[PDB]
Symmetry: C2
Subunit: 138 residues, 2 copies
């Protein structure tokens, strides 16, 4: 038994742990069956995706580029913003990944929503550096 | 005498109310003397600004363009994320403003920090649409 504030942090942090050790056989862990990944802002044009649509994007990316050394860490000096009543955790993050065409690195704001028990992830929302992601896509 | 959650939301909401009715004579309200404005991400290239450096940009923008009908509203469906222990409030916002070169409008993630009493703003951090802001400046 953990305090609800800490348990919300462990559950939200597992999202980044699952990405660092990602494997198609195991896949996505720590989420509900109806979890949704939201990409902010709406001007970027990315629609919301379920636990199965993100997998299809993962698989399609494996056939185009190689992805090695995923790394996620909080920005130094930032603290987890936790709202126990709404079951929400806010993170200020940086993501690192080695692609075939060099290095991927950007700065993000993550918003996690858990279930009532605070054990599984219900919603994951991330605000994205639009100028860099548009440049990476093009 | 309000509950801290409602008091933190009102103190953080005053930032948008002060901007909608901004007047150089009245100036910035609801902030401590050492309040710092932060513009995320760091890739955008905007240094942190004090209470007087933000006023200087306001003055410098009045000589080049005209700003009218400043509007701000929470994105429908979003709720204020409040961390009472950290004195932090998170918003999902849209800002509207009319300039000389058309309409300004974009989506934001706002993070506010208050004093121990929860009556004044100590820090305001905003993550912006980098692809749209670099288009507006150019
Ligand atoms: Ca970058
Ligand atoms: Ca826009």
């Amino acid at each position: 038994a953990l305090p609800l504030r800490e348990r919300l942090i462990q559950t939200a942090d597992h999202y980044f742990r699952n990405m660092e050790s990602f494997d198609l056989e195991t896949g996505l862990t720590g989420r509900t069956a109806d979890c949704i990944l939201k990409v902010l802002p709406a001007s970027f044009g990315m629609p919301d995706r379920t636990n199965e649509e993100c997998m299809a994007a993962h698989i399609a990316t494996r056939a185009d580029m190689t992805m090695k050394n995923f790394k996620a860490w909080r920005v130094p000096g930032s603290i987890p913003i936790v709202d126990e009543a709404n079951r929400k955790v806010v993170f200020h993050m940086e993501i690192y990944a080695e692609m075939g065409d060099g290095v991927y690195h950007n700065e993000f704001i993550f918003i996690m929503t858990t279930n009532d028990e605070g054990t599984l992830l219900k919603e994951v929302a991330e605000y994205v550096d639009t100028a860099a992601e548009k440049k990476f896509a093009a």
